[PDB]
Amino acid sequence: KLAFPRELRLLTPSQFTFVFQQPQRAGTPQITILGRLNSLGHPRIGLTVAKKNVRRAHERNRIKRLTRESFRLRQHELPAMDFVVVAKKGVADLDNRALSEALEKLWRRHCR
RNA sequence: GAAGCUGACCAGACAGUCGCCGCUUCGUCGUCGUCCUCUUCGGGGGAGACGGGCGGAGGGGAGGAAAGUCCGGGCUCCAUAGGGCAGGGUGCCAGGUAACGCCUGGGGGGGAAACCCACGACCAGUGCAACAGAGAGCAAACCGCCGAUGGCCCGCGCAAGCGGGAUCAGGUAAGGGUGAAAGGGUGCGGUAAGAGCGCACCGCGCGGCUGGUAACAGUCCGUGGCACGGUAAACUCCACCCGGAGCAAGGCCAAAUAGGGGUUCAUAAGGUACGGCCCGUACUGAACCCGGGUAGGCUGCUUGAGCCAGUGAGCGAUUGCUGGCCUAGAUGAAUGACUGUCCACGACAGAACCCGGCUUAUCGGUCAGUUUC
RNA sequence: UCUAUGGCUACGUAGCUCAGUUGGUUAGAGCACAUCACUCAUAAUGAUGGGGUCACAGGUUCGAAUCCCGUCGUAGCCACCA
Ligand SMILES: [Ca+2]
Ligand SMILES: [Ca+2]
Ligand SMILES: [Ca+2]
Ligand SMILES: [Ca+2]
Ligand SMILES: [Ca+2]
Ligand SMILES: [Ca+2]
Ligand SMILES: [Ca+2]
Ligand SMILES: [Ca+2]
Ligand SMILES: [Ca+2]
Ligand SMILES: [Ca+2]
């Protein structure tokens, strides 16, 4: 069947800027999420892991894949909105379970 | 034959859901400027080149360094006839890939032979912080003193010159000596007793040789007596190599736009390129900056100067011949969770034009060798 | 507020801006604040603290901020048409 639908990701910088316009922000001192309303009917997610926040590329790939998996899992529940995630300094030392729970809590908060 | 140090490998693997990436293939939607065959187009057997157009089947996806440009190479457009520097690299020499700031045989050095080497030169230019130049360099009270022990009545020759002492001062004393690394010594009539100045030894310098394709060895004869001790990643010299730039090089397919200003121009050929300067080459306006968007599709992107097994060569790096093989290559950018096990309990770390290296991080183990009870 | 992977470019000395180049002295002014007659909570062309590992890891040298290779960090450029 169809693989991952590219219509659920932020590809061009235009969409990134559109989301960064005036989104609703929510996050912990580690990671934050900014969500805006769109007109496609399905939600979208974006990733933003800078090199200064995380130097090791393996950790960047790990966090990106974890966020994508969490989004794919909680896709039918989240509201039709485009989200963008941003990491900070102090997230590489977090474990998989703790980071997954934090992302789940952030998504539950963004649900409103 | 209880414990180190090199060396190749693994460092996470096996099975089950919810998910990413692509390749081949089965059934379909279509374009075809190939049309085989029906081809009067309100169609149809269509064979195939193709496409986020689709529903299934198979086998696969972190590397051991994908981490850093620190090197060389395949390709590419930018663009060049030849002579010279400047600034860059290779440097014990020899062999192999196309080669290298790659690997290996041999020699040499380094106090661990106890296992390393960024190891050419200086008998043309420069320096070498002594604070007494005695680490380019000439001698300082300080002991020495050979030259008459220049002389200086202290004794006498108060009558030819002699004894002593030191005159410590007016003489080079380069011989040990204290002053951060110091012109070779072990011993000698070693002058009136200081220095190869003279005598036996040399790892000190020049030429010859018997080993050896060379690097350099040498306990071998035959002399001249000394004419650098370093740093040469300190200037400089030699044997070879130097246009450089990167796949966000560029090569195609369409899709919305050389239209705009100042830098100066008979045949002086004044501007450009080979250069960063110079002889030379033949070709015509030149870069500072002002105008527009796309974020589209294909390649380089995964078939390598590789892999398996045998026959050879090379005392080794490496390479002649056979049978054969390849399931990631992307584009905000693929690896996750719950369970049964492993003990190798799972550290570092991630691919992106590519290949062969170089530097470093690299929890713990597998073995094949090397020092000590 | 943005942003990897790849090529090239410039550096890392008082908290901030700034120059020095084995010259052996082993190193320098201003901006944050106090002190001398501190003249209106600027004093002026003055001095007194300077609580700088000259970012980290090495090397020929007697010795290195300076010379050669290395690690980390920050900052900048890389899609074309007529
Ligand atoms: Ca396997
Ligand atoms: Ca590789
Ligand atoms: Ca010389
Ligand atoms: Ca000489
Ligand atoms: Ca002597
Ligand atoms: Ca002499
Ligand atoms: Ca271009
Ligand atoms: Ca591609
Ligand atoms: Ca990408
Ligand atoms: Ca990488």
Numbering used by the authors: 1 to 112
Task: List sentences from the manuscript.
Ribonuclease P (RNase P) is an endonuclease whose primary role is to remove diverse 5′ leader sequences from precursor tRNAs (ptRNAs). Bacterial RNase P consists of a ~400 nucleotide P RNA and a single protein (rnpA, ~120 amino acids). RNase P recognizes the shape of the stacked acceptor and T-stems which span the two domains that together form a molecular ruler. In bacterial RNase P the 3′ RCCA of ptRNA pairs with a loop or internal bulge in the C-domain (L15), while a conserved adenosine in the catalytic core contacts an optimal U(−1) flanking the cleavage site 5′ to N(1).
To better understand how unwinding occurs and delineate the structural basis for such plasticity, we used cryo-electron microscopy (cryoEM) single particle analysis (SPA) to determine the structures of holoenzyme and ES* complexes formed with ptRNA_GG and ptRNA_AU. The ptRNA_AU substrate has the optimal consensus leader while ptRNA_GG contains the slowest dinucleotide sequence at N(−1)N(−2). Only a small percentage of ptRNA_AU dissociates during the entire time course. In both ptRNA_AU and ptRNA_GG bound complexes, the 5′ leader is positioned with the correct phosphodiester bond placed in the active site, while the 3′ RCCA is trapped in the L15 internal bulge loop of RNase P. When a smaller nucleobase occupies the N(−1) position of the leader sequence, as in the case of the ptRNA_AU-bound substrate, it forms a parallel stacking interaction with G1-C73 base pair of ptRNA and A248 of RNase P. The N(−2) position of the ptRNA leader stacks with A333 of RNase P in both the ptRNA_AU and ptRNA_GG complexes. At the U(−5), only map features for the phosphodiester backbone are observed in both AU_ES* and GG_ES* cryoEM maps. We observed a similar inner-sphere ion coordination of an MA ion at the G1 phosphate group in both ES* complexes. Notably, the distribution of the three classes identifies a significantly larger proportion of ptRNA-bound RNase P for the ptRNA_AU (~80% ES* complex) over ptRNA_GG (~46% ES* complex) dataset.
